[PDB]
């Protein structure tokens, strides 16, 4: 897997 | 203090960075998933609207030549705010930029493991960027906890800095991606290896003059889908202490994280180019490249000779409190939930944020  | 969002040229001042040489002299990666095709037009808006210096870049294919490496729209975010912040932090100049694409056409995580591979391998980037994670309970499932952690100890070795944010999902990384889970607590890979640093979230607060006022920790509450949007930190179930976190006394076995932390509230965030547009932009995806640019002007003003700085940051940090901003309210869950921060290293948050020329001075007088 995720874009954080 | 006022909570809004920042130019990210502004964290220089917040930090205390101003005084810190530009980072000119080193070279800083960022890995993505995908091109960045567009993300390279919105740092050309970004340094022309700044009136900057162009920055020089370059994307790496780390995979096969015939990999899928088109851009990720949803990721074309992630890589502006990543590299916006990166440049804007780092004083306006890094040696280069270099963008490590991840092949999207690769089984499972192999894609995202070569590119961290091939940063590790070229050996160029002094600091690395990872604003990216997923479960660490999944990544060790499949493997690829353990295939990724072996090229982080060979960056540690050599001397690079991967920056890895630390989540947003709170306590509850492992819960369908935040949502609330009552007293079960969970954390992201790759924060939790021991070889990376780890880098939480703040809410940033600043007086009417710009300067710095104070930070709590990152918790916006549930979204309308009921997600929670806080800070990730506790404790990895399966990575070991390294040695240098036994100062933090009373705390299990294991990697505790993060180890610093920079901004991350969406209502104190960065403002960033996004295919064109301005947008105020958060997370811990923030944080970790505050601290690369940070960072990296520490390494110019050091020759790039600053290994890998996890046991320094421990020693130097709980002997010398003012070298940060000791976050002390806040807590990252809900509902009564979750970790609270407090004086000194916590859960939420760890040792805070760096005063930047406060460590250079240090590292003048200590080295790192
Ligand atoms: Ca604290």
Known sequence: XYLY | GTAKGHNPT????????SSAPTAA????????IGGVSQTLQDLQQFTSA????????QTIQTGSSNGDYSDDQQGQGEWDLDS?????????????????????????????????????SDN??????????????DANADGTLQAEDRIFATAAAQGQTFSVSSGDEGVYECNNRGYPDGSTYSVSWPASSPNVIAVGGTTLYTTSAGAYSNETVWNEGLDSNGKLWATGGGYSVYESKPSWQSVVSGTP????????????????????????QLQQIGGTSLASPIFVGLWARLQSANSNSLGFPAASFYSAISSTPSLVHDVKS?????????????????????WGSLDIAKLSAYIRSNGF
């Open chain 2, 25 to 32: 002299n080193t070279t800083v990666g960022i890995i993505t």
């Open chain 2, 253 to 276: 076995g294991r990697r505790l994280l993060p180890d610093i932390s920079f901004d991350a509230a969406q209502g104190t965030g960065a403002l960033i180019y996004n295919y064109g």
């Open chain 2, 124 to 137: 160029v980037a002094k600091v690395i960027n990872v604003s990216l994670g997923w479960c660490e309970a």
């Open chain 2, 84 to 120: 916006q912040s990166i440049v804007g932090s780092a004083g306006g100049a890094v040696q280069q930029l270099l963008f490590y694409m991840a092949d999207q056409s690769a089984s499972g995580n192999t894609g995202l493991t070569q590119a961290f591979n091939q940063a590790v």
């Open chain 2, 330 to 350: 806040g807590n990252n869950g809900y509902g009564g939930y979750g970790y609270n921060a407090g004086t000194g290293w916590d859960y939420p948050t760890g």
């Open chain 2, 10 to 17: 502004e964290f220089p001042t917040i930090y205390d960075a």
């Open chain 2, 50 to 57: 700044n009136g900057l210096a162009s920055v020089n870049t």
